[PDB]
Design a protein around this nucleic acid. Structure first.
Lengths: 84, 106, 72, 95, 98, 97, 87, 95, 106, 77
DNA sequence: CGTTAGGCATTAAGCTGAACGCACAAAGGAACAAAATAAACAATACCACCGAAACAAAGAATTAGAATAGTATAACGCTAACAAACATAAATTAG
DNA sequence: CTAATTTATGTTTGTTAGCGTTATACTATTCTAATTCTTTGTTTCGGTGGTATTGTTTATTTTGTTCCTTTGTGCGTTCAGCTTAATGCCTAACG
């Protein structure tokens, strides 16, 4: 069950970025939007995941629940409704 | 014969549970007896305001169930509930459908 | 619980009966290795040997569409 | 024989049947309403706690809750909620 | 001679149907792989609940949709429709992000 | 006569006021404004002088933050000036409308 | 030429040079003429918010005056904490 | 015979004389440092309280403070502060 | 002979006062004895980081006093202290002097 | 305009005559620095030198109370 | 899980003298501010374009779903033993 | 410049890590199903550059307008010590 991962930021694809953009009301999307949006997503996930990891490592636990992700998003001021 | 504290105020939310959560939430050492009655009152009124607009949205959509798309619609369409829940996002809620007028053709 | 299950395809019922066969002939065998061997043998079968299983799966598909015609 | 989840799931349904008898509700929307109830409870109790601390009060009474309601809830929601609350304490004290 | 639409004509219909629909627009498995890729660097060998990755996907889609709304506001303000990465950096800068 | 170029005095005032930490709002008119608005919420509201000084300081900070964001938005749109649409955008993106 | 006096209109007290200075502190090279009234309205609603919160604070304590700590606490809740006026 | 203001004014000056013996300080900057100390104390104690609640711990020990420090303070400030803290508890427990 | 708890850790901030503020701040029912030592340590280090940059700013300005303009300079010029105090404004502090490069003439 | 002015105290009449003195002996002097220096000198005067001014202010106070015996301060908006 | 009858010990309403805080008397240029103006440079209106993004069809390649087994892990309950609150005597310190 | 506020010692107590067990959801595997991502060839249109008009800001001078910093006095507001009723928390019982 040991494994290392790499290059998973290409897994969030460009016609899957275009749908997140066209939900927000965007009518035209340039070509260089994608890597910048992937980096924005990367730093946001890095902040919230580091917060969740510190939350779960304080509890002497080994898995990541959804409640800790909710607390991590609460600490950034983006509260999530729907998980407890 | 004795009657419950939730219906002593004529409400639905349990006064005892909010009293217990105010105690064990570690907000003060003591808590007044009017505090849970007030808090349950404002809570019940608040969820009444949510569910009434949600039912009107779902009946406006010719549906019979409250899915969270209706909750997101009822919250984002309001003015003074949008200020209460402006930062909060809603799971599986979607957005309020509105398109900028300059994007639309003439 | 009300959950509608997916209908079985050819390989699932084939591996079901053949895994029951292997578990009644062989003790002390781990099922992941069983399923590896069953997939290996199913890919070395000729297509002339599989038409009863795919036809039976097609019968389950027509039974499923006749049982739920407005299903999506 | 599982330990039981303490949640506000029954009372949201009771309020819904008081206000909307015909329409049903999902389960995930009930969880959303539970999370919303806990969020608003946390907001109001936190403002009441810090108000009792700013005035050096060791007791949270209904005045602090009323002030916190006037603080958080904007617009007519504030005065509607205060009217509901005072109606509730007058009901609870009259009995 | 096949019939072809115009650029933007299909885009409004897509905007409407995605604003109406409430599902997630990026697949769950690449998000699982990416979350497990990122969370190696803080502590290796973490197990992720499916509900946790789903909650992260919900908040991720919400954050990116809000950021793209602000991006469209800024690109419209500069009298453009095609948004650009400087609009993203601006809308992050004004927001208090960086 | 030798009048300066348009903006050079503005640049010198930019550097002077940014080098300065002074309060740019006179105290008496801000006192009058505060005791005029606050009567609408409640009457007989005297203010401590430190309170109105704090209000003036915080409004100065909030407005210079609003104005640096405004100039960001105006520079982004290829404009040196400031138009009120820039203020609208900077208040909207900050999530204050 | 002759001085003009206008009844009430306290928002107007915040003069036009005292706003050009606020924008010069913000690093602004040019200000159009339509900015002063909008900035006046912005300052007005900001003070309306903070003052209403501080009034509710001092009214909860039954104090007729508005101390500085009440303004600190009113600004803390909007995400803009004041340093220097006591905690 | 005035009642006395409890504040952190002396210890900021002690730290300043430890770190900068020649330069003096104002009074209003000392008030700013007092407000900053109280702000950071409130942030750290609030995160420690909510962490003890999320784990159902009725006792805030140094682990919660350490986790909250790793939460709030970004960059190398986090690990520098943790090293200072563990140095402090090793000093306090060795004596 | 007995020695104080602030210098037991070898610090300046009083352990007893932060212990008392953690008690009376109503954060938990109990509090560990390492909590105030840790909190005073991180606090003293934090104000050391502030005052060192402030003294370097005031000595860089050829002044001998710390006015809050120096504190605002020391906080806004830093990277990881600007994130801690990004929302907080400073009384009589002014701004960090920086002008956009397109406003400046060529 | 009908507005009753406040009566002068000791320091106002003292600074009035001494500021007139300074303005007839010194040109090119700003009045804020004048008043700063006048407050400084009034606080370094001994109390033995001020009794005529406080007594004259007391005469103005008794003249004020004899001129308006039914007077009470009324702040308005 | 929720409510209710009596102590008691803590806590907010009540009250008064005292201390705080603020406005305001004169002054008188200083510093500020409003108003009118020359014009100079910035906003903007318009036009060309070209390459950049949208649209489409095909296939590939990936995810979805399910059965399933192992399986690390997490969430239940006893138990000790340890650490923290509490009652009571110095000390240094500090506003 | 001496009250007061931190520090130390022993006691109770109530919290928590250690341990066992077990369940339970997690991870991996292998199949089909489907669906959707990527390539490649149109095609059409919006960002960007370049020029010209205009409209409005700025910098300045003149002429009011105010302000500012100084101490004592009057009055309204708050606050702190002391009284005193209110009340909420704990226990025992009940449903």
């Amino acid at each position: 069950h040991r494994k290392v991962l790499r290059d998973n930021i290409q897994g969030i694809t460009k016609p899957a970025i275009r749908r997140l953009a066209r939900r927000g009301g965007v009518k035209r999307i340039s070509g260089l939007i994608y890597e910048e949006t992937r980096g924005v997503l990367k730093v946001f996930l890095e902040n919230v995941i580091r917060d969740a990891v510190t939350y779960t490592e304080h509890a002497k636990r080994k898995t990541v629940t959804a409640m800790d992700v909710v607390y991590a998003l609460k600490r950034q001021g983006r509260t999530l409704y729907g998980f407890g | 014969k004795a009657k419950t504290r939730s219906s002593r105020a004529g409400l639905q939310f349990p006064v005892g549970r909010v009293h217990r959560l105010l105690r064990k939430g570690n907000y003060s050492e003591r808590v007044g007896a009017g505090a849970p009655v007030y808090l349950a009152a404002v809570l019940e009124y608040l969820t009444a305001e949510i569910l009434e607009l949600a039912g009107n949205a779902a009946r406006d959509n010719k549906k019979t169930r409250i899915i969270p798309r209706h909750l997101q619609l009822a919250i984002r369409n309001d003015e003074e509930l949008n200020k209460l829940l402006g930062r909060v996002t809603i799971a599986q809620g979607g957005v309020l459908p509105n398109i900028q007028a300059v994007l639309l053709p003439k | 619980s009300g959950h509608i299950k997916r209908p079985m395809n050819a390989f699932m019922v084939w591996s079901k009966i053949e895994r029951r066969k292997i578990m009644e002939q062989s003790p002390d065998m781990h099922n992941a290795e069983i399923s590896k061997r069953l997939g290996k043998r199913w890919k070395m079968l000729k297509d002339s040997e599989k038409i009863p299983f795919i036809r039976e799966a097609e019968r389950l598909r027509l039974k499923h569409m006749a049982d739920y015609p407005d299903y999506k | 024989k599982r330990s039981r989840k303490e949640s506000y799931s029954v009372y949201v349904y009771k309020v819904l049947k008081q206000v909307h008898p015909d329409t049903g509700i999902s389960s995930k929307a009930m969880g959303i309403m539970n999370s919303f109830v806990n969020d608003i409870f946390e907001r109001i109790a936190g403002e009441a706690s810090r108000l009792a601390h700013y005035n050096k009060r060791s007791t949270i009474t209904s005045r602090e809750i009323q002030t916190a309601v006037r603080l958080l809830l904007p617009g007519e929601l504030a005065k509607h909620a205060v009217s509901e609350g005072t109606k509730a304490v007058t009901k609870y004290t009259s009995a | 001679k096949p019939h072809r639409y115009r650029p933007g004509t299909v885009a409004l219909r897509e905007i409407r149907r995605y604003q109406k629909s409430t599902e997630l627009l990026i697949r769950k498995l690449p998000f699982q792989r990416l979350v497990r890729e990122i969370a190696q660097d803080f502590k290796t060998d973490l197990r992720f609940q499916s509900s946790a990755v789903m909650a992260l996907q919900e908040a991720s889609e919400a954050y990116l949709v809000g950021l793209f709304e602000d991006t469209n506001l800024a690109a419209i303000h500069a009298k453009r429709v095609t948004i650009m990465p400087k609009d993203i950096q601006l809308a992050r800068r004004i927001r208090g992000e960086r």
